[PDB]
């Protein structure tokens, strides 16, 4: 059937949508179409292109209020690619609190993490029962549900700045330095490469972390 309504969504809309890029995008919600148990929500991209989309590559173009997100939260959230800024879907691993500065921090589908503020957070329309189920990546679903399941029991190594430990990059082991800590962060450098990534304390791509 062809519905108007469906639960607090309203033909018409404004919303955000996943393209095949796996970045989300402006439009406007045209169509929503049942198949039984089934739904999907049809969307015009501001460039007049058209996708025919599941409950969970859909959200509202708002910011969610504090008591709406919850460890496990499926968002849309601010991806801060070199100098380049992209809405990209993720998992929220920390709420606001003292020792985070009041941030979230976000796990994003591709296994980068980052803080971010309230209004960088976009919340996803129809998310699944167990939500890291539609993350394409087998391993980084599976931490994910490690994660969010455990929580709030975290392993994370403590680590200063100045030591020197072996990260993890394409499958062997690399001589870096921790270089900064940002709450459940740290900033490492690659010593022969000469460059930084933030990576989770929690992470196994952290050798102490991993043994
Ligand atoms: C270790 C880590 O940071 C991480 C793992 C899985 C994922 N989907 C996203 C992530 O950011």
Same mark, same amino acid.
Request: aromatic share 14%; net charge positive.
């Given at each position: ?22 970045? !989300? ?106 939500? !890291? ?39 062997? !082991? ?23 990534? !933030? ?13």
């Amino acid at each position: 059937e062809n519905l108007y309504f469906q639960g607090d969504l309203i033909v018409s809309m404004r919303i955000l949508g996943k393209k095949r890029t796996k970045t !989300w995008h402006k439009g406007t919600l045209i169509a929503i179409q049942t198949v039984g148990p089934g739904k999907k929500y049809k969307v015009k991209f501001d460039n007049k292109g058209k996708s025919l989309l599941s409950g969970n590559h859909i959200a509202y173009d708002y910011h969610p209020p504090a008591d709406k997100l919850y460890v496990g939260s499926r968002v849309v959230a601010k991806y801060k690619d070199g100098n380049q800024v992209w809405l990209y879907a993720g998992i929220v691993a920390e709420t606001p609190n003292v020792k985070n500065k009041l941030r979230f921090l976000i796990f994003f589908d591709d296994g980068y993490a980052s803080y971010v503020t309230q209004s960088e957070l976009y919340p996803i329309c129809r998310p699944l029962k167990k939500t !890291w189920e539609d993350i394409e990546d087998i391993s980084c679903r599976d931490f994910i549900e490690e994660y969010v399941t455990a929580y709030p029991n975290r392993p994370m190594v403590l680590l200063k700045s100045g030591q020197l430990i072996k990260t993890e990059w394409e499958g062997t !082991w690399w001589k870096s330095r921790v270089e900064e800590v940002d709450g459940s962060l740290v900033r490492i450098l690659f010593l022969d490469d000469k460059r930084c990534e !933030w990576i989770y304390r929690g992470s196994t791509r952290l050798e102490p972390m991993f043994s």
